[PDB]
Design an enzyme around this catalytic site. Structure first.
Site, PDB file in Angstrom:
ATOM      1  N   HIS D  93       1.051  -1.067   0.002  1.00  0.00           N
ATOM      2  CA  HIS D  93      -0.007  -0.112   0.053  1.00  0.00           C
ATOM      3  C   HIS D  93       0.937   1.299   0.123  1.00  0.00           C
ATOM      4  CE1 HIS D  93      -3.843  -1.696   0.452  1.00  0.00           C
ATOM      5  NE2 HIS D  93      -3.488  -2.228   1.648  1.00  0.00           N
ATOM      6  N   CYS D 135       0.017   2.590  -4.414  1.00  0.00           N
ATOM      7  CA  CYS D 135      -0.938   3.861  -4.624  1.00  0.00           C
ATOM      8  C   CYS D 135       0.071   4.817  -4.457  1.00  0.00           C
ATOM      9  CB  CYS D 135      -1.957   3.630  -3.688  1.00  0.00           C
ATOM     10  SG  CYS D 135      -3.192   2.526  -4.455  1.00  0.00           S
TER      11      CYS D 135
END
Lengths: 92, 140, 92, 145
Positions: D93, D135
């Protein structure tokens, strides 16, 4: 359908956070390097090849010389950010 | 199939923004030698086939207008677009003569959803400005 | 001498400030594409050609589709940052 | 195209180099992050792939921030003299400029700084590659055309 950020290319004279060197008499290092490579290969090399060569030339051929010890013998490395989706040639 | 199509009438427009003299309120000194760079750049890009125009000591509004208008032109017969910014800079921003403007704001005008005639065409930005104050000492 | 930042290459799956897509059963877009192109051309294409092709693949071939309209039919564009000073080939 | 003289990195070494893969799938509840289903698939495709190229690949799973920092730092203190280059792939992430460990967040710049020229002299003049799958914000690209 294509991304709205695609096909952009940024060539920065230097990496994020560093100082960009410019000779008040012969112009900046990045531009000097970019122009020479372009004048000699602008029409036969792909954009990334050219900018890579510019990277090398600025990295090697250049090294400052200042009075203040803080600015003497300093180096520089340009930065290329590419979102291109094809090879770029300025010809044919 | 792997190369951008250069089969167009014009290579494209090339905007050179050459900021040399800044307002005292900015506290930025004169950028000596930038004219030497601007000229050399003008020949190279012209020589590649770009229809280059040089704008001097632009304000932040001026640069925004130049790039906005340029993005509103019709590039249907252009293979690509190029912009060169020579000025004072700081992380993520470039210097106008009256202050500073975000680079992302200058380039945003050309996003796919804001410049239909450049969609799928290369958009090049050459920025010769500072991005910080750190110095690269080198090694070996 | 050489700049301390030289010879670095960052291949991000997506541009700064955006979202990166991944299939719970297929793996992420960027990785699927990367591995695909590398299998095929890893040994005969320069790194930037390989990544430019990966950029095209993720930009074209993919488009999201969730129950939620907000995340429906979205695109993605990888981002390459290069400080390399030579062309990179993984062979010869 | 044409492989012109020395405009290419010298690939004449004993080995191509080390390839480190950090596969972060499970994160602590407190981070608010969820499981990254499909990441093992990427880790498998990637490992095979880079092994094929000639890299000596190592796969790390669910690393803490301290672990990633340490693991990368020790990789930079090894002798890369006989390696053509170095690669690192991060699967996790992320938010702008940061990548998630299982217990938190660490700056990507700090992870790659371990390999700068003045801190990893044996990878000097050699390509240092970082493939990052994380991300970088929340903004979604709607597209056009």
């Amino acid at each position: 359908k294509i991304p709205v950020e695609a096909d952009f290319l940024f060539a920065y004279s230097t990496v994020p956070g560093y100082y960009s060197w410019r000779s008040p008499g012969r112009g900046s290092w990045f531009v000097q390097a970019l122009c020479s490579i372009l004048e000699e290969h602008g029409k036969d090399l792909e954009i990334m090849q050219i900018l890579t060569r510019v990277n090398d030339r600025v990295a090697r051929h250049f090294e400052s010389q200042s009075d203040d010890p803080h600015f003497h013998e300093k180096k520089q490395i340009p930065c290329v950010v590419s979102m291109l989706t094809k090879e770029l040639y300025f010809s044919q | 199939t792997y190369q951008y199509n250069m089969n167009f009438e014009k290579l494209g427009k090339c905007i050179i923004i050459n900021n040399k003299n800044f307002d005292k309120v900015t506290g930025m000194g004169v950028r000596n030698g930038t004219d030497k760079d601007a000229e050399a750049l003008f020949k190279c890009f012209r020589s590649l086939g770009f229809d280059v125009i040089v704008y001097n000591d632009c304000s932040c509004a001026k640069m925004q207008d130049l790039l906005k208008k340029a993005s509103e032109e019709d590039h249907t017969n252009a293979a690509c677009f190029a912009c060169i910014l020579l000025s004072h800079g700081e992380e993520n921003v470039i210097y106008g003569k009256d202050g500073v403007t975000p680079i992302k704001d200058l380039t945003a005008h050309f996003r796919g959803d804001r410049c239909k005639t450049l969609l799928e065409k290369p958009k090049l930005f050459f920025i010769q400005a500072c991005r910080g104050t750190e110095l690269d000492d080198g090694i070996q």
